[PDB]
Amino acid sequence: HHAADYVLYKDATKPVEDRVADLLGRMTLAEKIGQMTQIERLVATPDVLRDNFIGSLLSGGGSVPRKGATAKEWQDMVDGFQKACMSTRLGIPMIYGIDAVHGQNNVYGATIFPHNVGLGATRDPYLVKRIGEATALEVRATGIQYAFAPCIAVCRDPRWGRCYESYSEDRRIVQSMTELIPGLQGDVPKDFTSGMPFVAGKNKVAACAKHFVGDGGTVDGINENNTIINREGLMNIHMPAYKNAMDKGVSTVMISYSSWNGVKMHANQDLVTGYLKDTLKFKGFVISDFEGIDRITTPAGSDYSYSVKASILAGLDMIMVPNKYQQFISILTGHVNGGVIPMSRIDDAVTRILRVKFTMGLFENPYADPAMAEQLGKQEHRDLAREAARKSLVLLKNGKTSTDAPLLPLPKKAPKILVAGSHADNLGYQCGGWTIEWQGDTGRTTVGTTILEAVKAAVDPSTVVVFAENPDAEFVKSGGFSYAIVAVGEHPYTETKGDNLNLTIPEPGLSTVQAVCGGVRCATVLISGRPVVVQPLLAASDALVAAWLPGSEGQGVTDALFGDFGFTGRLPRTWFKSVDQLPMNVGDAHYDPLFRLGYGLTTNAT
Numbered sequence: 284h285h286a287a288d289y290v291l292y293k294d295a296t297k298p299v300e301d302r303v304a305d306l307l308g309r310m311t312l313a314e315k316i317g318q319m320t321q322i323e324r325l326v327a328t329p330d331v332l333r334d335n336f337i338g339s340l341l342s343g344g345g346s347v348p349r350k351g352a353t354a355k356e357w358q359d360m361v362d363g364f365q366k367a368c369m370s371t372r373l374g375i376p377m378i379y380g381i382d383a384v385h386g387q388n389n390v391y392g393a394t395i396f397p398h399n400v401g402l403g404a405t406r407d408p409y410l411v412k413r414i415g416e417a418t419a420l421e422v423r424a425t426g427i428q429y430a431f432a433p434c435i436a437v438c439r440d441p442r443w444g445r446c447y448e449s450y451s452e453d454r455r456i457v458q459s460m461t462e463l464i465p466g467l468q469g470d471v472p473k474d475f476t477s478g479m480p481f482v483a484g485k486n487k488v489a490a491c492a493k494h495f496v497g498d499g500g501t502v503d504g505i506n507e508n509n510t511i512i513n514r515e516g517l518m519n520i521h522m523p524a525y526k527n528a529m530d531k532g533v534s535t536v537m538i539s540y541s542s543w544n545g546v547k548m549h550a551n552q553d554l555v556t557g558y559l560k561d562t563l564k565f566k567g568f569v570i571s572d573f574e575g576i577d578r579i580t581t582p583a584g585s586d587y588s589y590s591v592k593a594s595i596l597a598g599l600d601m602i603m604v605p606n607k608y609q610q611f612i613s614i615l616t617g618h619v620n621g622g623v624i625p626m627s628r629i630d631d632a633v634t635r636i637l638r639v640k641f642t643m644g645l646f647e648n649p650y651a652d653p654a655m656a657e658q659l660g661k662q663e664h665r666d667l668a669r670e671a672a673r674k675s676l677v678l679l680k681n682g683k684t685s686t687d688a689p690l691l692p693l694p695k696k697a698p699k700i701l702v703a704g705s706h707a708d709n710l711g712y713q714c715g716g717w718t719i720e721w722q723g724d725t726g727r728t729t730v731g732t733t734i735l736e737a738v739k740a741a742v743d744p745s746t747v748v749v750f751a752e753n754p755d756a757e758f759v760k761s762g763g764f765s766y767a768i769v770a771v772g773e774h775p776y777t778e779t780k781g782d783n784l785n786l787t788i789p790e791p792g793l794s795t796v797q798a799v800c801g802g803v804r805c806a807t808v809l810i811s812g813r814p815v816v817v818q819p820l821l822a823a824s825d826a827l828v829a830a831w832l833p834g835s836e837g838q839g840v841t842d843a844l845f846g847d848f849g850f851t852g853r854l855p856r857t858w859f860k861s862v863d864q865l866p867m868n869v870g871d872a873h874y875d876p877l878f879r880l881g882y883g884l885t886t887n888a889t
């Protein structure tokens with residue numbers, strides 16, 4: 284269809300399947316295996332991308348061009364990499380992926396949304412789709428096309444360091460939150476075939492249902508460990524949200540580090556090929572986790588040859604190498620050349636990677652759009668996040684006896700009030716993990732509003748606000764305070780650093796709460812990624828709020844504390860009495876919760 288140098292794969296009016304086949308039929312083995320290779324930006328250069336025909340780049344946690352980098356600096360990095368890839372013989376654009384898992388969270392000045400567990404508390408799948416929408420805009424502002432989200436793990440033991448990344452222990456709630464997908468990607472059209480990949484265009488991003496499958500079901504919530512459960516439990520708890528993901532056209536699926544009844548997920552041909560591909564009819568691409576194939580073996584990386592064979596034969600399409608790309612490429616090339624991996628397996632992986640790239644419009648818009656840069660940290664999106672933070676809060680207690688005046692909502696006018704605790708004026712702590720750094724961080728790491736700042740912004744001008752991080756009891760008693768807001772809880776963590784067998788918040792926490800509440804009527808805001816031991820915190824407090832990891836917009840906290848909106852959130856998990864009860868989930872036989880799933884007190888706007 285027209286000029287004499289016409290190449291069908293480059294014709295944007297042809298059907299995606301036609302473009303895929305046309306390109307595929309021209310590629311060498313080296314160009315094919317290059318598509319299946321994703322590398323970290325830290326090892327990428329123009330010659331490496333060009334000479335190995337690389338298919339994808341990512342930024343892992345905290346992998347950034349520099350600290351404080353603008354949206355424009357991100358776009359230029361990405362475009363730099365893309366220009367190298369476009370200069371190959373076939374000019375196959377790369378796709379760049381990142382963990383935008385509560386906003387575009389590696390990026391300075393990006394809106395940071397509440398983490399998933401909070402989002403579960405809102406029971407509001409439309410809110411979540413809207414967060415999808417806004418997140419895609421902030422991701423594209425940085426020139427990125429691909430977000431490794433949502434995590435649709437069903438966390439079954441809060442001792443897991445990734446429990447905050449799961450919407451709920453109830454798979455019904457996780458299923459309903461897969462609306463993040465069409466938020467990120469766009470609504471699939473009228474007559475869409477379930478399992479097809481979809482992205483609407485250059486203002487949307489490819490998504491990633493992760494981590495397939497049973498990541499949330501591991502023994503004692505040990506991260507990357509074994510999930511021991513029969514097929515029926517696997518299918519009825521851990522799988523259903525992947526099917527909803529198929530119906531919404533999720534573009535990619537990332538495989539889990541975890542194992543199911545002893546089999547590494549990265550080596551499981553039955554689940555990856557037999558079930559995801561052949562039974563759910565997934566036509567997008569399947570990507571490893573970060574050195575996921577290495578960890579097939581014990582020790583990890585001790586037989587990389589096997590790692591490659593097993594993972595690729597299992598059915599994985601793209602490998603998040605992400606550093607030793609030369610070895611990965613050499614090994615896979617060697618296995619194809621020796622007939623150990625058939626060309627049909629290679630052609631299938633490449634067919635899928637290209638399908639996603641063509642379908643999302645990457646060949647037509649390989650480069651970043653500088654007018655999208657101003658979407659980073661947009662106030663409209665912060666106002667959404669603030670809404671989400673407010674809706675996520677669960678009021679556990681609001682008065683020490685059923686006869687006391689309720690403490691919340693608090694009046695904005697009072698001569699003098701106290702704000703206290705390690706989490707009252709600490710942005711990093713209120714964002715938690717996967718914020719600027721991989722593990723999150725402490726203090727003022729990005730743009731936002733801490734609890735203290737939000738209080739100051741909310742109160743009557745005549746109200747005197749005093750901050751003290753960890754005051755003693757005499758300070759409180761002597762201070763002439765009308766009430767106190769005290770914020771404490773967990774430090775930021777991510778993956779295995781967060782695995783925790785005791786779930787007790789660090790000190791000082793409880794002792795500040797005791798000191799403060801012993802001198803004045805107090806509202807304790809508890810910041811955590813999960814239920815933690817809370818009886819002592821309850822005994823001391825007039826009111827206690829479980830605010831999860833609410834993100835950059837701390838005004839969502841005060842919106843509820845001061846009565847602009849009523850508390851409506853409900854526990855998306857069971858709150859245990861004791862860690863020895865664990866695992867303990869709603870529907871279990873000796874369900875003995877401190878607070879059951881669904882619990883939450885309410886208030887009315889004032």
Ligand SMILES: CO[C@@H]1O[C@H](CO)[C@@H](O)[C@H](O)[C@H]1S[C@@H]1O[C@H](CO)[C@@H](O)[C@H](O)[C@H]1O
Nearest residue numbers: 341342343344345382431493572573721778
């Ligand atoms: C930087 O991402 C993380 O980096 C640390 C730094 O050492 C690695 O050891 C971690 O295992 C990865 S975790 C893994 O990364 C994916 C991409 O970052 C992510 O989508 C996935 O959910 C994680 O399990």
Ligand SMILES: *[C@@H]1O[C@H](CO)[C@@H](O)[C@H](O)[C@H]1NC(C)=O
Nearest residue numbers: 505507508509541542545581
């Ligand atoms: C589970 O964790 C232990 C360390 O506690 C490790 O030795 C074992 O290999 C892990 N199993 C799996 C399947 O990851």
Ligand SMILES: *[C@@H]1O[C@H](CO)[C@@H](O)[C@H](O)[C@H]1NC(C)=O
Nearest residue numbers: 780781782783784785786787
């Ligand atoms: C609880 O467990 C974590 C390990 O994840 C540890 O850092 C902390 O010191 C422990 N606290 C108590 C009270 O045992």
Ligand SMILES: *[C@@H]1O[C@H](CO)[C@@H](O)[C@H](O)[C@H]1NC(C)=O
Nearest residue numbers: 689692849885886887888889
């Ligand atoms: C808010 O409205 C509910 C429903 O009628 C009511 O039960 C609750 O006690 C009210 N609280 C107020 C006005 O403080």
